[PDB]
Amino acid sequence: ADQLDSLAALLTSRAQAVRPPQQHVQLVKGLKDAAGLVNEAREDLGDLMMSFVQVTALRLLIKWKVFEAIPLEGTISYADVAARVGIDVNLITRLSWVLVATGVLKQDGSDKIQHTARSRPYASRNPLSAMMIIGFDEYLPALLAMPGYFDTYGKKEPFGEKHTVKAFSEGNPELTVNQILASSPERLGNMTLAMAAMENMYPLSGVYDFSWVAAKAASDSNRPLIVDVGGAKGHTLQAICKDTPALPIERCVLEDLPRVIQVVKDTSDAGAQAPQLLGMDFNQEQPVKGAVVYLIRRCLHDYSDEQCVRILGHLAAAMAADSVLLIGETVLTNPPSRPTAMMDILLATIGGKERTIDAFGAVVGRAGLRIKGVCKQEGGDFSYIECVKA
Numbered sequence: 001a002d003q004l005d006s007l008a009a010l011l012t013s014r015a016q017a018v019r020p021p022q023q024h025v026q027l028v029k030g031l032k033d034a035a036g037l038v039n040e041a042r043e044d045l046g047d048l049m050m051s052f053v054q055v056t057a058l059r060l061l062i063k064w065k066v067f068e069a070i071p072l073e074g075t076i077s078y079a080d081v082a083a084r085v086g087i088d089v090n091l092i093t094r095l096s097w098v099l100v101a102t103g104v105l106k107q108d109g110s111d112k113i114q115h116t117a118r119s120r121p122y123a124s125r126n127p128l129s130a131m132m133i134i135g136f137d138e139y140l141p142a143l144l145a146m147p148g149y150f151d152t153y154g155k156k157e158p159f160g161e162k163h164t165v166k167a168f169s170e171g172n173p174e175l176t177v178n179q180i181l182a183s184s185p186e187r188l189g190n191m192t193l194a195m196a197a198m199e200n201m202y203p204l205s206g207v208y209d210f211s212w213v214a215a216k217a218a219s220d221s222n223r224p225l226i227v228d229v230g231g232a233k234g235h236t237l238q239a240i241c242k243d244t245p246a247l248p249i250e251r252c253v254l255e256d257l258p259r260v261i262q263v264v265k266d267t268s269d270a271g272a273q274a275p276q277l278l279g280m281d282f283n284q285e286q287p288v289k290g291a292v293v294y295l296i297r298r299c300l301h302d303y304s305d306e307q308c309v310r311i312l313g314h315l316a317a318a319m320a321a322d323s324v325l326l327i328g329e330t331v332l333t334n335p336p337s338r339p340t341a342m343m344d345i346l347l348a349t350i351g352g353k354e355r356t357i358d359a360f361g362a363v364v365g366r367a368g369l370r371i372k373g374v375c376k377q378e379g380g381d382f383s384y385i386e387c388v389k390a
């Protein structure tokens, strides 16, 4: 009733902008919710099946260099595309038609094809096309394998390095997800490039005031400022310190697995001044004691509650009474949004989960900590949960 009226107004409005950053996303959500309302189950399942055929056509046409063979502007015949890529024109045509019917491609006349704004990213190698490939190659098989997986392993939340849904779907339940993706650096390459999209997002500086850390940096000129626990390449630490002279990158500690820390070293320019580099295992005792801030960003969602309590317990033991622990993770609403529920199930294929603030509270308290506050990013659920010793 009412929601149809609301969306209908957001439809009239955006029709004259054709002739507002929140305005785009209030309309994409309303269109989805309206679609769900008008739709009955039979239309739902036809829509679902169409999504699977569409991603399959996307995957094949990328793989076969068809999007490359279509000029970014102007038209080209199906015959000319098929000769360029050396493929049966009938098969090119049937798969292209899927994307024409869904608006990803545009057909001109009876025999010519052209790119749209929605298909051009697939014409080259980049984070978006890497995400498409990874979704199809690394997540869909695991999803389709979940019915058999839960009959095989029991119908409970899956956790643990071995016997992931992913490894089960690959025929190799004994191997870890790292071993699987590392045994074909072409696969690792698409995984790495795809994660480049979301490495920029949700910057910690500007969302969290570190002035209070500056005052600590002066009042104690010796103590470690910010320890980035599992910080990968240390980009979060860099952004924090970049143009803050009172927060010196040289006073911070980047921690990760020794193989990751070694790669950080081997890819730094000579005089580039960096934080301290420390290879370690955060399932073990925290080597740096009494830092002002411990940061653990996008690590806890990979693990069970019990493993998270062990990880956080090591940080709490190493923290001082005035220390702060910052957990950077999605905080699910109850119920969660569409993209975070989707990521929650994707994480289940590799032994992880997303969590509500209640689930984080249980884990944090078990580690001898307490939640002092939460800074949530605007327009999403990614947050920094500020914790202190209990």
Ligand SMILES: C[S@@+](CC[C@H](N)C(=O)[O-])C[C@H]1O[C@@H](n2cnc3c(N)ncnc32)[C@H](O)[C@@H]1O
Residues within 6 Å of the ligand: 199, 229, 230, 231, 232, 233, 236, 255, 256, 257, 260, 280, 281, 282, 283, 296, 297, 298, 299
């Ligand atoms: C999802 S990445 C997060 C990287 C970074 N914090 C960020 O926000 O982008 C998880 C990181 O944890 C590291 N890691 C995994 N297991 C670890 C362990 N046992 N000890 C230390 N680091 C670990 C990985 O090497 C990886 O850099």
